[PDB]
Design a protein around this ligand. Structure first.
Ligand SMILES: O=c1[nH]cnc2c1ncn2[C@@H]1O[C@H](CO)[C@@H](O)[C@H]1O
Ligand SMILES: O=c1[nH]cnc2c1ncn2[C@@H]1O[C@H](CO)[C@@H](O)[C@H]1O
Ligand SMILES: O=c1[nH]cnc2c1ncn2[C@@H]1O[C@H](CO)[C@@H](O)[C@H]1O
Ligand SMILES: O=c1[nH]cnc2c1ncn2[C@@H]1O[C@H](CO)[C@@H](O)[C@H]1O
Ligand SMILES: [Cl-]
Ligand SMILES: [Cl-]
Lengths: 434, 434
């Protein structure tokens, strides 16, 4: 028997741009999409649960390809600074004061509540105290990628690059065989990681078959300083070190010349486009249309809540579409169908799981969300693809499933206690202002 | 006796950047802010109504300085086109088919429901069938500026420029002595209005003491074509015609050289910055920091729902702050306090009513909104100014007052029927797709 049959007014499949099924239903078995049928054929089938969603659009869950989830606890603490000043003089000192297992667990949980509330099903995270992020991920039920940050300087978490690596690998070993939990290696950035450390990461990632998650080409200063310090721009350096390959998720990728776009395409890396953070830190505009035209998977992330300051993937996807048009002065850059692809299927491609999630397709896992379009904000309900990108908001997501399992139903969180999340945030407000 | 005393956790006054009152209350009498006192002193005072808003921020209502409200009915019908193509081949033909009194009334009402829901208290509108916009404005209770559009070409509404003017003035005469309703003259744009029509508008606006509301310098094509057709860029032409003065609200103002920034400052015009529409139509980035540094009142508008596609002033204000930083590559451009000023006090300045609304100040009219910050999206609650701009969403506005009168309470609309609005939208969906 089917576990669930969910019928909706619209289904955006993301299998082909523009494809929207009307009055169809999704049958779910063993956590996967087992059938996609006219809703009329669905009552004749048996199911453990049945759900009718009139005036709702069903679509793949949104994939946040770049977050620092625990930074939810620092929301609004460090505005109006460019990247290096922001890290050096505000973020790193605050992180030195407050970041331990407790912070990371509490902050990750808070972030996950906010993400589920806005229709995010997968988070590609990157932080410290990775066992705490993993624990939070198993608790929330989100599809979770835990990025083990690697730096050269000592922190409360680890004393040197080898220690970040050893601790990440030790923590990874405590969460083996978890279908929805995946550890990655996350060397922080070209300007905080040495050639030797990058080589160790390449070797380890290859041996253990892990993704590499790294902030790359975020600022002009990073790129220009790299030439001075390493003799070439960061991408060329990383190519020399062996880092560019399909396992690499390159966050930001704001400052690129045309040769670097082709380099990315040839090595089959993916990028995470984080428009709010790129604007807020005054980093610049990633040439996402050029990357996508070259065949590169460009997903979308939010970055952390201290440089956004939302974890809202619908808002982030709209912003990607708007910024692409203003940056190219071409109104046909990133149409709504492409933006949805960025927020879903391209994220899955980046994470090496596009055969598993990212579209509404029989055989794929049921990572799905439903948006209630019967609100003034999305009225009249003409084209749901257009509305999802340009009009709908995080507040309209009504239901969230990961592998067929409900994480939210009629905006009630089913795996996390929303009151508990608010209380942890209030605790941290007191502790940080202390 | 006070009509209302509203106590809140935070009050953002907008009287000085950064000023936030904690645990204070606003006493309202005769539609105006009569006192701002510590909340402890408030129970000792008598009031017809008392309201406690723990974890809420109270602030001035948001002022949408540029809308085409009835276009709510066209939401998502015309994406991925640049301005002239969009108007010529999509918008104007659709407007020729569907726009009459009924469309404008229904569409304005729908827009007003969405605007109130997101904390907008004043709308500077610009459309056709102005008596219908006026009627909708009196119904909703919003502070409403009705912009009587003037074009040269015949439409269902009017046959020539003189007819747009005569009809607007006739309709204005039916709504005299309304405190919350103000008619303006709205010549459409430099490229749709002749020198003779502009002169008639200058003369009429002076005689009747009316504001002038006009789309100016929206695109590079407009500015370059003006030189060919009129011998000078549009602002210089309008200066020659007498249009630049404090009564002018110049919408868009995207393509400006430094001489035009100073011209604007010298004539004391204001601009409406409409970032989503400027990005979506691929028009460009208005140099709002330069204008503001020169002393020009720069407010924020949404434009119409077919080029946004939201009427969300919180989202529009965040976008203004983000776009300013990425466009100048200066993270200190448009800090959150300045963005709030743009969305409130600068709108009031533009509309010539900054002595009346736009800040929380004794003697001013009680155009106020309350946002519930006790949500995951704005947790932890550190600085409410930062959160309002970078984290809070339209869904968190709980209460709206215009002149002390509640237009929304705990997200229930008090002057409009939300079900009726949804039904009109559904009616129009059917009629437009027919
Ligand atoms: O946009 C960013 N660029 C570079 N570093 C960042 C950004 N956001 C957060 N972090 C920092 O990266 C570390 C986790 O890998 C943390 O120190 C976090 O504060
Ligand atoms: O555009 C794509 N379509 C399908 N799969 C893709 C695409 N790009 C990368 N992959 C990757 O190919 C493998 C088999 O599906 C998976 O690793 C998937 O992520
Ligand atoms: O961003 C814009 N620029 C120019 N015209 C516009 C824009 N948005 C809507 N209209 C058009 O202006 C008229 C009302 O004055 C309407 O025809 C409307 O469709
Ligand atoms: O920065 C300002 N502060 C106060 N009033 C202003 C400002 N700019 C323009 N006005 C205008 O001056 C008159 C008296 O207050 C009003 O017309 C108001 O809108
Ligand atoms: Cl080195
Ligand atoms: Cl002329």
């Amino acid at each position: 028997r089917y576990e669930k049959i969910i019928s909706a007014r619209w289904i955006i499949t993301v299998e082909t741009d523009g494809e929207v099924l009307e009055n169809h239903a999704i049958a779910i078995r063993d956590g996967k999409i087992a059938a996609i049928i006219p809703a009329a054929d669905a009552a004749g089938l048996e199911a453990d649960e049945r759900l009718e969603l009139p005036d709702h659009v069903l679509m793949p869950g949104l994939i946040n390809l770049h977050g620092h989830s625990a930074m939810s606890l620092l929301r609004g603490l460090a505005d109006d600074k460019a990247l290096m000043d922001w890290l050096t003089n505000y973020i790193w000192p605050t992180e030195g004061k407050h970041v331990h297992d407790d912070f990371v667990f509490d902050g990750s949980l808070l972030a996950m509540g906010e993400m589920i509330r806005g229709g995010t099903t997968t988070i590609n995270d990157m932080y410290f105290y990775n066992a705490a992020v993993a624990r939070a991920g198993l608790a929330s039920g989100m599809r979770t990628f835990v990025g083990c940050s690697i730096l050269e300087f000592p922190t409360n978490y680890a004393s040197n690059a080898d220690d970040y690596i050893a601790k990440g690998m030790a923590e990874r070993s405590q969460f083996l065989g978890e279908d929805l939990l995946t550890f990655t290696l996350a060397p922080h950035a070209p300007y905080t990681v040495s050639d030797d450390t990058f080589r160790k990461v390449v070797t380890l990632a290859e041996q253990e078959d892990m993704l590499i998650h790294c902030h790359i080409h975020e600022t002009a200063d990073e790129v220009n300083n790299s030439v001075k310090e390493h003799g070439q721009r960061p991408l060329a350096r990383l190519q020399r070190l062996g880092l560019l390959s399909p396992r690499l998720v390159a966050a930001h990728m704001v400052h690129l010349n045309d040769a670097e776009v082709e380099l990315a395409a040839r090595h089959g890396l993916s990028t995470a486009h984080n428009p709010a953070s790129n604007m807020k830190l005054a980093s610049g505009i990633s040439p996402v249309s050029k990357l996508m035209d070259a065949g590169v998977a460009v997903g979308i992330g939010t970055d952390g809540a201290a440089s956004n300051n939302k974890l809202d993937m619908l808002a982030e996807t709209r912003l990607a579409a708007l910024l692409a048009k203003v940056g190219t002065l071409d109104p046909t850059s990133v149409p709504a169908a492409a933006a949805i692809r960025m927020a879903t299927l391209n994220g899955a491609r980046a994470l090496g799981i596009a055969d598993k999630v990212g579209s509404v397709k029989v055989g794929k896992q049921a990572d799905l969300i439903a948006l209630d379009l019967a609100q003034l904000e999305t009225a009249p309900a003409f084209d749901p693809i257009s509305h999802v990108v340009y009009a709908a908001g995080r507040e309209q997501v009504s239901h969230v499933w990961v592998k067929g399992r409900a994480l939210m139903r009629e905006r009630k969180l089913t795996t996390l206690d929303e009151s508990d999340l608010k209380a942890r945030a209030g605790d941290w407000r007191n502790r940080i202002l202390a």
